[PDB]
Amino acid sequence: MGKLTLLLLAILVWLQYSLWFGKNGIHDYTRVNDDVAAQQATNAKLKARNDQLFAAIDDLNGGQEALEERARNELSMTRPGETFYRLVP
Amino acid sequence: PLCLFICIILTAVTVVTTAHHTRLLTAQREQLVLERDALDIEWRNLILEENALGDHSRVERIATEKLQMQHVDPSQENIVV
Amino acid sequence: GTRLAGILFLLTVLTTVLVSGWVVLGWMEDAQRLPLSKLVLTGERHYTRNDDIRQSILALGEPGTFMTQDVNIIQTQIEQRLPWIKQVSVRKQWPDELKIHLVEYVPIARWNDQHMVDAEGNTFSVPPERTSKQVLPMLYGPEGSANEVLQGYREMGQMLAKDRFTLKEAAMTARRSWQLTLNNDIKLNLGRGDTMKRLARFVELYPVLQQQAQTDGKRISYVDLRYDSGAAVGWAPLP
């Protein structure tokens, strides 16, 4: 024992200190991991929001399935022969 | 004893392992930041093209082209809850 | 004297061990070099057969013995041969023991056409002959949205079947529009707006909608519902 083993002991603790509080240690890993985890979750929603709107816009050009929904909903106009009903409270 | 020396080998391996992974996540978080900005800019371009297409002046003129008829109140059946 | 009897008793017991230890060894040594053939398919199998596993395991090539056949390669091969299997566990035990356990997906709806979808949202495929015997709803939607349509179908179905309606088909587009199909070819054309509130309206409008169906003798072709507090109902001549 003496210093033949203690000199090699405190260095391990300095590595345990520098493992958690290092420049890229455990704390920075956990800190960055949470930042990456939350950010990519948002980009999933943002992409899902854009992809849905991109699909909507991709329909109004050369297609009439989505344009007919805009004409029905916002202009209240129907096709010839369809008996239009309405609900009043 | 000499077991501590071996633990230092493992700890240094863990340090290099942890540092290598954090250096990769930092390179990815720096990429997710750029990914969001390109989405919102793409999102802004989309909402403008929707207005250019979801324009009632151009939606109604194509609706009447597709044999549509504006809402008439006579031919409109009503129901109470 | 005692050591003579002892050493002889020692070497007599020593002899019978080496003889038995060699005869029994010949049983396990010559039986470790044979391709294991028999299997026991444990688990709840409804879509797979016994010959399905036998054909898929010898399709790799050589039969393979104990200490020469990887169990991970078998469970891997079986997984790519049968898409309706959730998890495979191929385990061998001594000679001729092919303990292959199986777990199948349970189709509760037919995603698109060629595929099914279980209650947990996972996607898989089953040949048409092994599932045409069961009737289940037809779910449609863009790729990857297999679970998204399921939540809509069940929420819409719970409200719809609450009033003795049968939701046979539920179609969704990439732009998140909807198009339901009811019994007797009653096509519902919904839109990207509030769907569970438009659906709750058609439930209330249905008495008057059918009331005018036989008033002039016309089956309900479709009910276009993408209006605000309104619905444009089509008509079809009954056969």
Residue numbers in the entry:
A (entry chain B): 1 to 89
B (entry chain L): 39 to 119
C (entry chain Q): 22 to 260
What are the paper's exact sentences on this?
The essential membrane protein complex of FtsB, FtsL and FtsQ (FtsBLQ) is at the heart of the divisome assembly cascade in Escherichia coli. This complex regulates the transglycosylation and transpeptidation activities of the FtsW-FtsI complex and PBP1b via coordination with FtsN, the trigger for the onset of constriction. A core complex at the heart of this machinery is composed of three type-II bitopic membrane proteins, the Filamentous temperature-sensitive proteins B, L and Q (FtsB, FtsL, FtsQ). For a long time, the FtsBLQ complex was believed to act as a non-enzymatic scaffold for the assembly of the divisome, but recent studies revealed it to be a positive regulator of the FtsWI complex and a negative regulator of the bi-functional PG synthase PBP1b.
Finally, it is important to note that two CCD residues, FtsBE56 and FtsBD59, are buried in the FtsB-FtsQ interface, especially for the interaction hot-spot FtsBE56 which has an accessible surface area (ASA) of only 3.8 Å², about 2% in ASA ratio. Crystal structures of FtsBE56ALQ and FtsBD59HLQ mutant complexes were solved, revealing a displacement of the FtsB α2-α3 linker for ~2–4 Å. While the overall structures remained almost the same probably due to the stabilization of crystal packing, the coiled coil might be more prone to move and this tendency could be transferred to their C-terminal linkers. Although no conclusion could yet be made, the CCD residues, FtsBE56 and FtsBD59, are likely to function as a negative regulatory element to allosterically prevent any undesired movement in the balanced interplay between FtsBLQ and the PG synthases. Mutations of FtsBE56 and FtsBD59, on the other hand, may induce a conformational change of the coiled coil to further enhance the activation of FtsWI, impair the inhibition of PBP1b and promote constriction.
